[PDB]
Design an enzyme around this catalytic site. Structure first.
Site, short mmCIF file in Angstrom:
data_model
loop_
_atom_site.label_atom_id
_atom_site.label_comp_id
_atom_site.label_asym_id
_atom_site.label_seq_id
_atom_site.Cartn_x
_atom_site.Cartn_y
_atom_site.Cartn_z
CG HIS B 297 -1.89 1.15 1.26
ND1 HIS B 297 -3.21 1.03 0.84
CD2 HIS B 297 -1.70 2.41 1.71
CE1 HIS B 297 -3.76 2.21 1.04
NE2 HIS B 297 -2.89 3.07 1.57
CD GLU B 298 1.82 3.46 3.61
OE1 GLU B 298 0.77 3.14 4.22
OE2 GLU B 298 1.99 4.58 3.06
CG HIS B 301 0.05 6.11 -0.76
ND1 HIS B 301 -1.03 6.56 -1.48
CD2 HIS B 301 -0.38 5.67 0.45
CE1 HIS B 301 -2.09 6.37 -0.71
NE2 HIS B 301 -1.74 5.83 0.47
CG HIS B 307 -6.32 6.50 0.04
ND1 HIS B 307 -6.28 7.44 1.05
CD2 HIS B 307 -5.39 5.55 0.29
CE1 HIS B 307 -5.33 7.03 1.88
NE2 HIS B 307 -4.77 5.90 1.46
ZN LIG Z 1 -2.94 5.11 1.90
#
Ligand SMILES: [Zn+2]
Ligand SMILES: COc1ccc([C@@H]2CC(=O)c3c(O)cc(O)cc3O2)cc1O
Ligand SMILES: COc1ccc([C@@H]2CC(=O)c3c(O)cc(O)cc3O2)cc1O
Ligand code: PRO
Ligand code: PRO
Ligand code: PRO
Ligand code: PRO
Ligand code: PRO
Ligand code: PRO
Ligand code: PRO
Ligand SMILES: [Zn+2]
Lengths: 346, 346
Positions: B297-298, B301, B307
């Protein structure tokens, strides 16, 4: 610019070798070997033909180009750089752990303390970091070490007993009961043994060798190599752990040698990819650093190679330190036992 | 007889001997569980490289339909697959002391709350011999979080705004000062992070991720994730060990979480293959087993992913345990930051 990766042999450690060798991708990597008065640009590639586990510890091999005369070994616990310079084999052996590195440095230093030669540093040297101090690696020139030490002449006379996808052939090495072996030493024998096979008739197309190392309860009942090999082969037939693997290659390994300074022994012409059975493809081998290529020589006999007349042949009847088959007759026998035919070319 | 792994007695040696036999062409392995079998075609993952404190960790994949992955280091092995959408891990450590420590670590939260559903969420696995010590642990992290009723950790505000050969991009993970992490846990985060990238627009053609793990002297000055990431990125610019690697990706890792149950944080859209610099592509991530995909997830980004609105997306604003990008807008941003263009196809 961009700066080529390099290894400083005046301070080379395990972490230096691991970070460089772990950066080697599929396309290979240029690494410059540097020392006082020495430089070598080597194109390093991962050896994808050979797999090695030592008591389940994964060991990876690396090659230079043929002209580089350079090989590497990398495990989680140790790394080896070995290259040829002016006809001599030089190894840089670095262990990750301080205790094991100290133990290894002391082990390799111990034979040189009684001789106390003036030119000791060219044969053996503890290497320290560039920044008391403990060694980060050892440099051993085996050829210069043999000239300083008064080692008794160990040989191969009578070291054989007469009886799209490459095939994976396991080379099951078993640490003899009561024997202590060093991972850098065992893996160097395995690497030289495997590379002596692949250098013949493009044999990586036919075979990929997978070396494994475990401990056996078997111990040779005496110093005699013939009696030792007889018992080792019998121990394999009675071993439940070897059940289902009677068509693989086996080696009993130790650090030392057998009576009459025998370095190793094997059943001659005992492995063929179509008929391998009953643990026939078995032998014994020393793994000590000062005798490189003994496992390669014994693997040669197992694949059908006879003693060769060229004193530079791996299969010469006397121990020489040469690591390649030069005999065309032996090369054809070995390759045919691994499924190769003359019409296939190299 | 096809090779098999018995899930009622699976040990480190069982997994290592099977996974070490996986050649270039892959290998069929049967997973046996209470009389039901799943045949998996296992392949070596050649896209990702991992070292944890210089210890080499190898990844293995099943076919897409197999929903199975493996991890293999010298010290531990992991089998992870899905059943009813739930993630099940078999974690086996080689050493008896470490295996016992791991089994106790994972059992401990369940000893406070003795649940009826305990064995389906967590189980110590023993050898098939009828004072035994576990050979592995089975953890269903979805069932475990329902039993342990853990406080809801989320991703709200977890971001801060400003070829023939794939490019190697290092993901330098640094164990925060005073933090303890487990190798099975760190490597699972790395594996899920890398596989979330390769599943997008055939990105293995453009990038090969090389994860490394070392310890840093940096520790977050507070529980706040924003302040923590500010300090981490500043620590990298002042760290002599990071000099020359300001164009790589960095993660500060820990076992725990930050204030307001923040699982991780990262600089949004901070990595591009052409302009990467000044340690901008940096973030922080938990590595605990119960929150798989936080590093993925990181990393999303960092590669520019925002998101997503689909609750099954890896980039959903709430933590879900889903490990893949589903947003086409995010997939295009991530792939373009790694050198991909629409005309290249997938
Ligand atoms: Zn996030
Ligand atoms: C193919 O994977 C394997 C390769 C070698 C072996 C050897 C096979 C073997 O012969 C053997 C032994 O003699 C002693 C020992 O302690 C362990 C041994 O295991 C087992 C395997 O599962
Ligand atoms: C494989 O090449 C490398 C990759 C990462 C590094 C990292 C680079 C790095 O940032 C670093 C650190 O911050 C702390 C530490 O203890 C060790 C570190 O080494 C060094 C390399 O030589
Ligand atoms: O891991 C290394 O390279 C150093 C040197 C031996 C002890 N630690
Ligand atoms: O001088 C020595 O012992 C070797 C030769 C090449 C580099 N180091
Ligand atoms: O050494 C050998 O065996 C071969 C025979 C002819 C010349 N060289
Ligand atoms: O042609 C030669 O001389 C090589 C070396 C011995 C046998 N074949
Ligand atoms: O053989 C194995 O893999 C496990 C390790 C702990 C005890 N038995
Ligand atoms: O389910 C199976 O096939 C094996 C047999 C004993 C228990 N696990
Ligand atoms: O079982 C479930 O519903 C969750 C969703 C993704 C991972 N497992
Ligand atoms: Zn001989």
């Amino acid at each position: 610019a961009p700066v080529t990766a390099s290894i400083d042999l005046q301070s080379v450690s395990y972490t230096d070798l691991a970070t460089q060798l772990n950066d080697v991708s599929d396309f290979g990597k240029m690494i410059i070997l540097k020392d006082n008065g020495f430089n070598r640009q080597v194109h390093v590639s991962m050896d994808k033909r050979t797999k090695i586990q030592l008591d389940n510890e994964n060991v990876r091999l690396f090659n230079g180009r043929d002209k580089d005369s350079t090989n590497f070994i990398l495990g989680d616990e140790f790394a080896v750089l070995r290259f040829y310079r002016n006809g001599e084999s030089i190894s840089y052996i670095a262990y990750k752990e301080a205790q094991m590195m100290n133990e290894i440095a002391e082990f390799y230093a111990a034979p040189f303390k009684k001789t106390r030669a003036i030119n000791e540093k060219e044969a053996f040297e503890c290497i320290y970091d560039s920044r008391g101090k403990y060694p980060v690696s050892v440099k051993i020139n085996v050829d210069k070490a043999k000239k300083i030490l008064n080692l008794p002449e160990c040989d191969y006379i009578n070291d054989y007993i007469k009886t799209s996808e490459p095939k994976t052939v396991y080379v099951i090495c078993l640490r003899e009961n009561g024997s202590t072996v060093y991972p850098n030493e065992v893996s160097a024998q395995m690497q030289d043994a495997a590379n002596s096979v692949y250098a013949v008739h493009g044999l990586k197309r036919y075979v990929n060798l997978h070396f494994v190392l475990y401990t056996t309860e078997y111990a040779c009942p005496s110093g005699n190599a013939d009696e030792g090999l007889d018992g080792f082969t019998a121990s394999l037939k009675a071993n439940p752990k070897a059940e289902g693997y009677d068509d693989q290659i086996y080696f009993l390994i130790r650090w030392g040698t057998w009576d009459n300074n025998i370095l190793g022994i094997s059943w001659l012409n005992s492995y063929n990819v179509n008929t391998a059975s009953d643990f026939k493809a078995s032998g014994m081998s020393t793994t000590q650093l000062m005798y490189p290529g003994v496992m390669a020589h014994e693997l040669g006999h197992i694949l059908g190679a006879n003693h060769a007349d060229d004193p530079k042949d791996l299969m010469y009847s006397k121990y020489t330190g040469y690591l390649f088959h030069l005999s065309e007759k032996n090369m054809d026998i070995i390759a045919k036992n691994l499924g190769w035919e003359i019409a296939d070319g190299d």
